[PDB]
Write a protein that binds this ligand. Structure first.
Ligand SMILES: NC(=O)c1ccc[n+]([C@@H]2O[C@H](COP(=O)([O-])OP(=O)(O)OC[C@H]3O[C@@H](n4cnc5c(N)ncnc54)[C@H](O)[C@@H]3O)[C@@H](O)[C@H]2O)c1
Ligand SMILES: NC(=O)c1ccc[n+]([C@@H]2O[C@H](COP(=O)([O-])OP(=O)(O)OC[C@H]3O[C@@H](n4cnc5c(N)ncnc54)[C@H](O)[C@@H]3O)[C@@H](O)[C@H]2O)c1
Lengths: 319, 319
């Protein structure tokens, strides 16, 4: 497998890029992003990490044509909250980069991964154990563009035989890289605002349950879905989930793990109406069945690791 | 009541633009298109006809700014058959023109109608009396872009308060336009063939039912929906239908009228797989109930009208 990741320097890409370099050999992985990594970023100083604007279609084709990837994880998008404030940029990046990637996959025979999201859903979806197949009525421009992503990929599969694969990722939690302007960002800032002990102001309301998942489970599935023989895939897009929580539940979990009575001031934010139009939980039976999606981490295990890891990697108070 | 039409010179835009000039006075109406009207084009010569490529937002804005519409019907799109063969074009037009249209509706406070289509539905929609809210899995790039069109316009309404209105149009019959190799244009080829007493070569399978509507009812409806008080509109996107027929029912209808046999040879054309994935009929009761959508022509009525009108408009043989 010769693998290319676009949008690599972000939350997902960072841990993805490292896990692919580790699993497959730093030689077999090329990675790229619009910016250059800064001084402290985990992929800084590493070979095979290019600067590439996915909107520059010639640059995109030239990187691909030279590297001859066989897999591609196409990760750039503008996410929910920031898309509502910069919608022109979200229409650009999430439609046009997506289109250039599908065309390069076709032209150059690439198995292509594009994440969708629970943001593709909206208030008519069936919010409890949402099925893979249901009414799609997202209420953010982000989700809108990702419904397009899902349908456009599936059409490329049908029309040209392009091996397009996707999963509707839920809230993904990690320590390495701080998230990129979505609603689930609160969780990770709570973990920090527990460490520094400063008042966590949480934009999301306390009992708003969302599907969520910890990064190593997320990394395991990203690869596993892409390892799978095409014949085992009954569809192109799949719900996967780790487990659901509310911000009062994260608060509690971190409150156990630390032995502290930490402060959260629930000052509602733009994220709130966004989250509320999302499902409380997904049915991911079809992924479990088709290609063996599996979770190990529960919410308490996640906190253990998280409070243990931010200090190492970022240098906040330890123990 | 002031009115911009874009893509005003095609099938719908010709009989919409003439209906609107009549009803609301020619000084209220501006029609535009990327192409000039042909000398034999109904709109030839006439005051109030403009040439605009909607891919150029600056010109669209200019025209919009000069004229100052209260209303806009935005009609340009590459439909289903041509889209599969020219997807680059379908994606540019169906997505980008739509984008610039909604933005100008936002910026200059215009009531904006953009039609969707039954082609936004796929094989999972519920093919009998299809509902307004259902699973939307389009088998065409056209269909894919129209779903995006539905969701991006619904989001414009919630985010900025744009008055976005839309209906899913069934197959649309009119004498005023020629038999192009489109998806539902077998119906219109079978009339010209019938008066010419040639054979009809029908690419669509003999008992493929489809939602259809005779233009009269479409122009009535396209206006009824744009005249409605906002508070009556329970939704942004409505199914409307006239009536469903198959090619064999349309055959029995023509022949009842001619009192001759006319012979049709059924083959496979590209239209067949596309039309097979579309529904057999639509539930349009939301459109009846909120804004009084109504249908006057049945299939015999329509055939009688078309038999008359075509020789008149295109030189063909008659009775
Ligand atoms: N992390 C989550 O909770 C989550 C959930 C669901 C889906 N996703 C999906 O995962 C993908 C990435 O998520 P993330 O959280 O890692 O994003 P991020 O915002 O952390 O990273 C996005 C990266 O894209 C890069 N980028 C932006 N525009 C670019 C361009 N034009 N060319 C090249 N690179 C560009 C930025 O440099 C950034 O590194 C997105 O498609 C997102 O919808 C993430
Ligand atoms: N005809 C049908 O039965 C039917 C059914 C369902 C939905 N619709 C929708 O109704 C709308 C109009 O359909 P139609 O039947 O008149 O199609 P049409 O092709 O007959 O007319 C389309 C017009 O768009 C113009 N155009 C193309 N590119 C343009 C651009 N860049 N800028 C400005 N104008 C451009 C074309 O010159 C043409 O005059 C389309 O959205 C179509 O998807 C039509």
């Amino acid at each position: 497998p010769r693998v290319l990741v676009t949008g690599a320097l972000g939350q997902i890409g960072t841990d993805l890029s490292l896990a692919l370099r580790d699993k497959f050999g730093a030689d077999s992985v090329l990675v790229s992003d619009v910016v250059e990594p800064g001084a402290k970023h985990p992929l800084a100083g590493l070979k095979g990490v290019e600067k590439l604007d996915c909107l520059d279609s010639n640059g995109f084709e030239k990187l691909v044509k030279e590297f001859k990837p066989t897999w591609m994880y196409h990760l750039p998008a503008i996410m929910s909250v920031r898309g509502e404030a910069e919608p022109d940029l979200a229409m650009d990046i999430n439609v046009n980069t997506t289109r250039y990637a599908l065309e390069l996959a076709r032209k150059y025979n690439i198995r292509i991964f594009i994440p969708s999201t629970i943001a593709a859903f909206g208030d008519k979806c069936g919010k409890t154990m949402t099925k893979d197949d249901t009414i799609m009525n997202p209420s953010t421009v982000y989700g809108v563009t990702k419904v397009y992503t899902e349908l456009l990929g599936t059409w490329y599969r049908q029309k040209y035989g392009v091996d397009f694969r996707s999963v509707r990722l839920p809230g993904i939690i990690s320590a390495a890289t701080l998230p990129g302007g979505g609603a689930t960002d609160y969780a990770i800032h709570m973990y920090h605002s527990a460490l520094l002990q400063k008042k966590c102001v949480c934009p999301v309301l306390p009992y708003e349950s969302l599907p969520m998942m910890y990064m190593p489970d997320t990394l395991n599935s990203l690869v596993k879905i892409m390892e799978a023989p095409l014949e085992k895939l009954t569809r192109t897009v799949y719900n996967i989930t780790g487990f659901s929580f509310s911000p009062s539940e994260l608060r509690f979990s971190i409150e156990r793990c630390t032995d502290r009575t930490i402060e959260v001031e629930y000052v509602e934010g733009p994220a709130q109406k966004i989250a509320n139009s999302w499902p409380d939980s997904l049915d991911d039976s079809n992924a479990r069945n088709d290609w063996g999606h599996q979770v190990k981490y529960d919410i308490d295990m996640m906190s253990e690791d998280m409070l243990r890891q931010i200090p190492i990697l970022h240098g906040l108070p330890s123990l």
